Chains A and B, each alone.
Chain A
Amino acid sequence: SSKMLQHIDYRMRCILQDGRIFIGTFKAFDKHMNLILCDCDEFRKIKPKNSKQAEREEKRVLGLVLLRGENLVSMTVEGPPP
């Protein structure tokens, strides 16, 4: 079986090693688990640095993303193919 091919073309959330989140349409992959994500958005967790400040999530729009496979931790699905 080629399990990641079942997850193809879905809106998928991909967790990077430094803690980032990549939500993108998972178009393609290969042996090293590089990803091609269309319409991908990255999400950085922001440390609060205070006792009363909340923890926020900053989202950057990226577009067509090639994610190198050594950065990837784990991928989950968010949505059907749009």
Chain B
Amino acid sequence: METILEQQRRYHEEKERLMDVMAKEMLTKKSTLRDQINSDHRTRAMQDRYMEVSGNLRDLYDDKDGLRKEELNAISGPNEFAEFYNRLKQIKEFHRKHPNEICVPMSVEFEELLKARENPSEEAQNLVEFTDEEGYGRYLDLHDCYLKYINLKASEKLDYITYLSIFDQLFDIPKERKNAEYKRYLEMLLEYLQDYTDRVKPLQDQNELFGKIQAEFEKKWENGTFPGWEERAQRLFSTKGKSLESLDTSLFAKNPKSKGTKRDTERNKDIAFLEAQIYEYVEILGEQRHLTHENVQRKQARTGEEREEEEEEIPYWLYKLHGLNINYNCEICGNYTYRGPKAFQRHFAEWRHAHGMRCLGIPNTAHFANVTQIEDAVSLWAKLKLQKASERWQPDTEEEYEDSSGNVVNKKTYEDLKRQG
């Protein structure tokens, strides 16, 4: 198999097709948010394919350096070309047209007018990735988190708007004591928020964003990133200030910080990392947080109906003498109605009535012109069936086998007897 030449050529071509397709997408105009997010999610799956193909392309050159000398030998050789060309003379009678090596990759990573989702991503669905309240990146649902929050505080003195003011907090006084049960809630609220950030920006590198937040956490947040001018340095885990950086550094190796209290860096690590991630993701989604708050205030102020609508988003004598206004209907002419008896008689023998009779399978005739029911028409076509004849030569056979008093045979029987002997 030509790994060196053919496979790398095909993988390079497939990459070029993927670049052309997501370029064609970024060339085209977009009109609504759903279809923008749908294409951006589609382009993400194409990028996943591009990265995997590029992976395989890079892990296919080790044996290439093993055969490169033999490959570069274009003078001493030639017999292998002949040997392969002789094997290409196999299966000559392969009567088939083959226009699919580039047309299938091109038409695979393209889409068809009724559904703006390509063949790779053709089962992709934004409503398995977003709920209706979120409106494809427009809003975040925090109603569910508000309900879990009521249970957590153990009291109802707290509205949805009051709840949003809590989630506008950043680095100030906490809502509850940070060593209490607030931690389980904060973990869940974040997991929703982190999934949401990546979900609404599917063209951005998730691994880059995660690695950046991790690096900022380790190199700054755990290393004294909050300083005042008790003010001097604040440590997230141990919930206390400290005099000078010298006593902060020597406190980072003490048992109460390392493992010797219940708010330490061994036990409370995941929650402290989570408290940093919820902070950085809410800053990245600050526009969307404003949009949810506006939407809550707009939904709150409404009437009933406005809320329900947003949740949805005179010739009398001449007509008497002519025969008008007369009850008549022709069931043969597509069950049409007639305003007169002469109109019913002319509608029974018409273009539409004959077309309906031909589409039903019953050919019309001179006696079946006034037929209305289809049950009588079958009997009329059966009795009209070429009267009753069809018998020109049903006995002529001239049987000579008898030669006494027994010349009995039919037309087909005498034909079979003449064909047999």
Q: State if A and B touch, Cβ cutoff 8 Å.
A: no
